[PDB]
């Protein structure tokens, strides 16, 4: 709880460029063979994002301000991203939100949480019998005063590590409007070296949470493994960005999907 990772090394927040990233479907309206103009919280094109990573001598789990909204992107292999921590004070003094994936269901709860200085989930003893099963929970010591609970449908997540190019890509958008948390998700395979690939993708709605709480800061949950300050991390890279109220031109095709966007 109060123990900090020994292997974790502090590093400066290097920045990288994003191409079109941050575009999403604003609403549920269907439109086809038309060009629509709308203003909302977006990630400007050709903007600068932050470069974070986790590996067996540098590990990054910094606190970041939520502001109005943020854009997250991660290139995954073992699905090292375990969730996110959302809260104002990040303590039991207020109601905090935890979006976590246990590899079975997606657990989303709003309670009074005991905050750990460096929350994570460890996994022990891979060797033969590859395991990859959650054991220690450092996310929170205890919880109470729960005003919300949600559990997704059962599913099987593969946590086995992979080699070569990153086989998984997850780009999410997190924002709060009128007490409604909006989550937009997109997953597509890519061939990448570093930074971000040049291309267009339109994010789709995942879930809608009418929680109605204020989030001034957030963290990114990561999974650690070793064959609790001596754990190690696998090679991964994730990104964070700040959304701005920018107007885009969303070009709709005959099928209704966005072909391309243009920043005014």
């Amino acid at each position: 709880q109060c123990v900090n990772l020994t292997t974790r090394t502090q590093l400066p927040p290097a920045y990288t460029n994003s191409f079109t990233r941050g575009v999403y479907y604003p609403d549920k309206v269907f439109r086809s063979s038309v060009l629509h103009s709308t203003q909302d919280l977006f990630l400007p094109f050709f903007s600068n994002v932050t470069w974070f990573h986790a590996i067996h001598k540098r590990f990054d789990n910094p606190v970041l301000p939520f502001n109005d909204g943020v854009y997250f992107a991660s290139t995954e292999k073992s699905n090292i991203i375990r969730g996110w921590i959302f809260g104002t004070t990040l303590d039991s003094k207020t109601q905090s939100l935890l979006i976590v994936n246990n590899a079975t269901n997606v657990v989303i709860k709003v309670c009074e949480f005991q905050f750990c200085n460096d929350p994570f989930l460890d996994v022990y003893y891979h060797k033969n019998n590859k395991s990859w099963m959650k054991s220690e929970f450092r996310v929170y010591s205890s919880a109470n005063n729960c005003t919300f609970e949600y559990v997704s449908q059962p599913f099987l997540m593969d946590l086995e590590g992979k080699q070569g190019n990153f086989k998984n890509l997850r780009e999410f958008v997190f924002k709060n409007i009128d007490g409604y948390f909006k989550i937009y998700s997109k997953h597509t395979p890519i061939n990448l070296v570093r930074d971000l690939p040049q291309g267009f993708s339109a994010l789709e709605p995942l879930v809608d949470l009418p929680i109605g709480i204020n989030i001034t800061r957030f963290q990114t949950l990561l999974a650690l493994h070793r064959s609790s300050s001596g754990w190690t991390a696998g090679a991964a890279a994730y990104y964070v960005g700040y959304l701005q109220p920018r107007t885009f031109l969303l070009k709709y095709n005959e099928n209704g999907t966005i072909t391309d966007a243009v920043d005014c």
Binding site: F30, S32, F148
Partner: protein, 242 residues
Amino acid sequence: VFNATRFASVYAWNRKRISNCVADYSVLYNSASFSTFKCYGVSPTKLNDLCFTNVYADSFVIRGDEVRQIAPGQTGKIADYNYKLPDDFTGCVIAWNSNNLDSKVGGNYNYRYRLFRKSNLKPFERDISTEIYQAGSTPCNGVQGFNCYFPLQSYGFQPTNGVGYQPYRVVVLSFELLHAPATVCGPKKSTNLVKNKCVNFNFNGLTGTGVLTESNKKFLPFQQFGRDIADTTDAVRDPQTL
């Protein structure tokens, strides 16, 4: 909650949070499973038309003479020392005769009540404290004695007790609408669909008049309705079917 076998003690009364679901009170209203049903400020028909953020169901058992003591802004053994309804209470009160169930031979001590308290409780307040009631100036030392009374007491529920002393299951529904998004809502009755005719249609939160015909358009799984170049709705997706 209304049909549950046993409840918590009155001073301990169980607060059952009903959130994020549909609440249909027309079934319980027409179920004829209750002895008396009385609402304050809102009828059960209106409840099915409204959305409430948190619905707290207060369940507990009391004697007959104590049932008349539950109203918004009143006093009594239940009101002052156990549970009181605020003056603005919009909810309903429902009761039924459990004498054949919650009463035992020789008395039922599973249910208890607070007979004494150093002051009066506020509405929506629950106090389980066992602190001895001190009537006089003599310190009670946490025990009963001269000018000292043990406030917690047990009911005498028995199958042979009189109507006034027979146990009744009192479910007080506390309806609180807050600034947070309203979760609990009442049932909204859908009707049959008609096509190839001029009609006035209401679909979810949209309305309009026109002829509805099956088209070849395909909405994405998350897209309920389309619009035209003019931002007018040219199509819709059935909320029930696909």
